[PDB]
Design a protein around this ligand. Sequence first.
Ligand code: Y01
Lengths: 339, 8, 57, 204, 283
Amino acid sequence: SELDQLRQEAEQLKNQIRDARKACADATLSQITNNIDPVGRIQMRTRRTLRGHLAKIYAMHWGTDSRLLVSASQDGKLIIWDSYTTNKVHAIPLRSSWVMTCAYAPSGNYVACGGLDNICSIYNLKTREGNVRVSRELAGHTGYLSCCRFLDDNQIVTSSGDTTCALWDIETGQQTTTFTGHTGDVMSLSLAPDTRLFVSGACDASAKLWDVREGMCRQTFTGHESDINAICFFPNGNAFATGSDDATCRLFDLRADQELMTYSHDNIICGITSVSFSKSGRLLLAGYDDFNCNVWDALKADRAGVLAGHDNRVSCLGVTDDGMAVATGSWDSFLKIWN
Amino acid sequence: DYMGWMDF
Amino acid sequence: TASIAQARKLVEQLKMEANIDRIKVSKAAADLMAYCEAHAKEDPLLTPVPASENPFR
Amino acid sequence: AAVERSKMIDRNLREDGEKARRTLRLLLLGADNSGKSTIVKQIFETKFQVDKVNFHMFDVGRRKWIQCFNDVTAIIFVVDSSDYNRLQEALNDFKSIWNNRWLRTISVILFLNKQDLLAEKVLASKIEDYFPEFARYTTEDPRVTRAKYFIRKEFVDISTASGDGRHICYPHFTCAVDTENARRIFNDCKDIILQMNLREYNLV
Amino acid sequence: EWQPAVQILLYSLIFLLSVLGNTLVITVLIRNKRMRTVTNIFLLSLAVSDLMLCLFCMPFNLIPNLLKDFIFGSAVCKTTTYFMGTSVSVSTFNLVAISLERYGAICKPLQSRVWQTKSHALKVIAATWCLSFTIMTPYPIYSNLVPFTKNNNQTANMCRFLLPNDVMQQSWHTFLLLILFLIPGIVMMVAYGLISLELYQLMAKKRVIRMLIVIVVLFFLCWMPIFSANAWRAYDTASAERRLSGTPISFILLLSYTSSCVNPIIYCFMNKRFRLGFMATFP
Ligand SMILES: CC(C)CCC[C@@H](C)[C@H]1CC[C@H]2[C@@H]3CC=C4C[C@@H](OC(=O)CCC(=O)O)CC[C@]4(C)[C@H]3CC[C@]12C
């Protein structure tokens, strides 16, 4: 009775949201920016190849400064890389080998790992002992951690397989806000440049916009059919692009509260693992399971490049804040720095 | 005369 | 009562999603194009930089 | 010292990868109270050493976390043979763990623990009631051997049709106090590495 | 007249096949990184050695045989006699190396995983080439031209591998017979016999077993005539050159060269894996 009434009310609210989104749209992104100058054939070449890991590389994250990135692999080693000179800065032994995520802090003082151990280990890079040590084992989660993003040095948003997301006061080690909207295992997380909102993607093919201060899902974007493996914010901060296993990539607008354009190809049957955005927001780069990163004009939806340099599945792709270099990581234990 | 061969 | 509480939380979250500000997709697309054209001179990917400016060879 | 750091990091992780190649990592599946803890006679882990060959066990307390285990040596599946109601659930779990998109090259060790409870269940087991296709089946005690062969065929007929020579199941049997699990795991992993090497070194 | 015609036809047939059959293997294995494995590193070195064997043996052992004079110089005679010996050594040792890895994989699989790696495969290839080059270094030193005068009062040359005395010459050919022919003769036999015994104790099983027998028998068949001829001429080269020299030894040396034309066939072109990659590498 009451549960049926609440289900009917939720269905009516979602139907009203869908009707408002359908009535709000009149054109697409392509119909607006069709008659512009394209980026041409981007002859983006493998500038650097990072050959450190000995197992499958699940995730990577670019630093604020262009040179540094961090990569997580199943061997139980977390590796920080210098992209310009192909050097390795930090190799971090992991208590649990099975690690599914890594993150680099905007200020560069901290990296966070997670995985099947159900613990978000915050690693302090700036230590007076002389080595990277665990700063805070965020143990509140009851499932495997899939994505972690640092809002700042004392706040971190994490995603997990327990179907919830949480904001963690790293100083206290306790969840400050818990985001309990997803009905499936949350797989991805992307922060906004102002650090006042974020979007997360889960296994129920739903992307949800959460306010950090409010703690509520302000907007829910349900444009995918498969598990959203990764998500990324457009550099302005008013749109984001996703990627799933259904061979499709969709760009969703925050203000329009809906999707703008699908970035999929008929020649792709495999799944997308990672998506990232260029500096001007006109190239969208998506890693794929066909072993090949496809580069897409983010404003024109044209496959302007194919980054073919990996033997096994591409798992993690990123574009620097400056926009110079794109790094792709793969199941074959290699990271390739492009342009 | 041509009598013999190379070893290999 | 846990299912009823979760359903009421879902109803509250969708009611919070109902009250939101929506702009037209044309204005959002124009803003995306304006940011693209404003930072196109700053983008190293759409237009390739020479090897002196490029830190990668 | 800034380039030698990346060399010394690479030499330290190279020695760590040699030790992980020596270890034959294994994964455990099976439902609750299926006798999975009874198999070990010595994310939870346990270690035991047989004949200068290491084995590592893994069970997680599904399609997303199973992706980490597509490079293990074998999957150890434990089935409670005494109960019949969750036998179909065990069949569905074996179907899900075998016909996996990422697990297309891993053979499945299939232990059938606590066969003694099935032995006094038979000697006291409505096997014709649970399965209507138990009739027209012709294989110590003859009825215990008949039930064991029926369980064996009922659990390998899914693996035989799928797989396609890349990996085939290799079941066993175990009592409550049986200590032949180490030798069975050793022989089964010997055959698994043999069937992989045959393809690796272009003999087949 | 009949005999030179069937000589040139057979020599060219083995030549152009060996040349085509070794350049394809080198192309496919270098370009395709994914294809590369422990045994493929061995097959790649074997293909290069067979290609080196083809180019420095066949035209240099047929044109001087047809014309009955060595028309090239002494430096050509020295440089080519070294590459012929080296290529034979690398080819035979790569076959033994493949058999030893194969024995490790089948008889003792668990123990093998600790040592049998791709880095280990490169070390064996490096040791194979460095040892074969070192042992075949007497070949340029002791091979020089020897001139003779024909019936028409012309000049001619013979490139001959002749040691200073026959006491070292008999011990050389005995040493060469054991390590090149006899030791692989029984090492490849015991290695492929244990593998065949462990597989026999269903029609695909009997496939692999009989192909191992073809490897050892064609090893014997290719190298038995020339190695026996070398042992024959070591102790008495009067009876050997009266019977075999000229047209018969051309066919003996060609059957020996056929090994570098059948090794890609029985190791790569009969692989289901390698044919799928060969159709992918080329458009
Ligand atoms: C032209 C004539 C004088 C012969 C030249 C002799 C060497 C310079 C050649 C012959 C065999 C070649 C080797 C055959 C196989 C390999 C393995 C190959 O390594 C790999 O496969 C890459 C590692 C991987 O598998 O990913 C490339 C180098 C190497 C040593 C080759 C290096 C160059 C070698 C030693």
